Design a binder for this molecule. Structure first.
Ligand SMILES: CNCC(=O)Nc1cccc(F)c1
Lengths: 237, 300
């Protein structure tokens, strides 16, 4: 069924699962035409597919050429996502295939269920969590590879860097959602927080800075403060 | 004109014959139904005065044999039987019609209702849906489940309707997942019409049979089947023009005949609103939309 706070430890058990987020698949800029009408121009996008236990991120880049000459792009994008997820599963050895795929928006259920009819033992599930994965494009290295791509391409990352050497997957996931929620609520402040200190750097093979245990607690506290802040500024509290 | 005689009516019962019905009181001198129009299937059905639980009944075609009803006090129901020797069957039926012990099937001459509800229903196809081959007539009741209901218990007492499932490998071609899911024309026309039903008359006959079992017995699996078969047509972008026109006529008479007080349970709000207002065929069911909107505007 659906995925919520009562079964949240399930994400970190030993059944392979993937989250699929389609919020950045179809991306547009809206602008005025010479005649004073409005038109859209698409820009590259991505499917964000993540194993929450391992941190493995299967980032499928959606090049704008996949929309050329297509109609009803918002609907096509859900089916394109499902096709790519199905192709990914099929590419994985059987022992690496997920037992569950959890979609962050309910509109993906039918498209993915249809594309995975071949896989009746794989459960397709929604979630009641409001996960902040749409902010994935605020991670500079991810945004850079999407915007530079000249063709469809799959790029693999670990979204937890080396964190699992020191913390559990539950704590790594919680850190990730806090960081992404902050970037979603106020990207400038979140980024200032993360990079203010010039002595903490991002290793070439990582996405986030190389914080010690102590500095991650400071950082985590500052991100909570930010998410409290903007919540006041937003609601005047 | 043919006759369904009764040995007796030992228990009080409401008797249905097609869309008509009348009450028989316990041990009332009733010996059956006469003047039944030849040329159409028929259904004779029962609801006991004591136990409204279990509506039940028999689909039959008078051209296929000489049938009578005998109450069975062990199984507790009115059973349809077959008389082998036609000579003796005629000796009894005449004797009773002389003593005027029968209700007359009450067809109005302006009324084509029964015809319009059973146009495509054939007894040979009923017997494939209801598997009990040693009888030329077919028993149905309220509680019988469908083959698909047994997949989601007794297989012998099931309704073997054609399984329709929009999220199945049969409904969806590899590589056209989106196309086939949003426009069901492949499943309707290639899989079902050409592959399984052979023609639209057999498709419409199953649809009509499913509605009648829903309406007369409150059979829930039949109601699901009727809606499924409507939805598959309405959700197909490419449907022969003559099927659409006939569909509109079929549904119009079904909606016309439906008891107003049963609409809440027999009509699926989602299917009808989708079909009339959202689907590829939203503009193709003029008669049906007009009657639905004037008779059941609540549902919409
Ligand atoms: C018991 N012998 C069989 C039998 O009763 N047959 C029959 C035939 C016609 C009408 C009827 F009421 C009964």
């Amino acid at each position: 069924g659906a995925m919520n706070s009562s079964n949240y430890a399930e994400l970190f058990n030993n059944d392979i699962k993937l989250f699929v987020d389609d919020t950045n698949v179809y991306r547009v800029t809206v602008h005025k035409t010479f005649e004073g009408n409005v038109a859209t121009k698409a820009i590259n996008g991505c499917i964000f597919t993540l194993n929450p236990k391992t941190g493995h991120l299967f980032l499928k880049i959606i090049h704008t050429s996949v929309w050329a000459g297509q109609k009803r792009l918002s609907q096509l994008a859900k089916w394109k996502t499902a096709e790519e997820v199905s192709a990914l599963v099929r590419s994985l050895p059987k022992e690496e295939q997920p037992k569950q795929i959890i979609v962050t928006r309910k509109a993906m259920l039918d498209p993915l269920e249809v594309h995975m009819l071949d896989f009746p033992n794989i459960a397709i599930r929604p979630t009641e969590l409001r996960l902040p994965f749409s902010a994935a494009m605020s991670i500079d290295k991810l945004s850079d590879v999407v915007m530079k791509a000249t063709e469809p391409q799959m790029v693999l990352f670990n979204i937890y860097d080396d964190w699992l050497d020191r913390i559990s997957s539950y704590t790594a996931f919680s850190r990730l959602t806090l960081l992404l929620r902050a970037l979603k609520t106020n990207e400038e402040s979140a980024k200032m927080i993360l990079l203010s200190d010039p002595t903490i750097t991002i290793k070439s093979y990582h996405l986030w800075p190389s914080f010690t245990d102590e500095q991650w607690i400071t950082i985590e506290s500052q991100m909570r403060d930010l998410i409290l802040t903007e919540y006041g500024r937003k609601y005047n509290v | 004109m043919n006759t369904v005689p009764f040995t007796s009516a030992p228990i009080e019962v409401t008797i249905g014959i097609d869309q008509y019905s009348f009450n028989v009181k316990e041990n009332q001198p009733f010996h059956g139904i006469k003047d039944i129009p030849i040329g159409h299937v028929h259904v004779i059905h029962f609801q006991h005065a004591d136990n409204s639980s279990m509506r039940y009944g028999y689909w039959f075609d008078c051209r296929m044999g000489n049938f009578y009803i005998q109450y069975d006090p062990k199984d507790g129901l009115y059973k349809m039987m077959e008389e082998r020797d036609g000579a003796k069957f005629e000796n009894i039926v005449h004797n009773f019609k002389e003593r005027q012990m029968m209700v007359s099937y009450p067809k109005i001459d302006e009324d084509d209702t029964w015809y319009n509800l059973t146009e495509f229903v054939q007894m040979d196809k009923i017997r494939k849906i209801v598997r009990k081959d040693e009888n030329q007539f077919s028993y149905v009741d309220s509680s019988m489940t469908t083959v698909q209901e047994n997949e989601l218990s007794d297989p012998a007492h099931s309704l073997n309707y054609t399984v329709i499932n929009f999220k199945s490998r049969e409904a969806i071609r590899p590589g056209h997942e989106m196309e086939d899911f949003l426009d069901k024309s492949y499943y309707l026309n290639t899989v079902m019409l050409q592959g399984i039903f052979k023609n639209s008359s057999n498709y419409f006959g199953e649809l009509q049979f499913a509605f009648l079992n829903a309406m007369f017995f409150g059979n829930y699996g039949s109601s699901l089947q009727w809606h499924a078969m409507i939805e598959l047509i309405c959700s197909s972008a490419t449907v022969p023009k003559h099927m659409l026109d006939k569909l509109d006529e079929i549904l119009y008479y079904q909606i016309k005949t439906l008891p107003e007080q049963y609409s809440d349970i027999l009509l699926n709000e989602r299917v009808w609103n989708i079909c009339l207002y959202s689907s590829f065929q939203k503009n193709s069911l003029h008669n049906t939309e007009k009657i639905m909107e004037n008779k059941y505007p609540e549902l919409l």
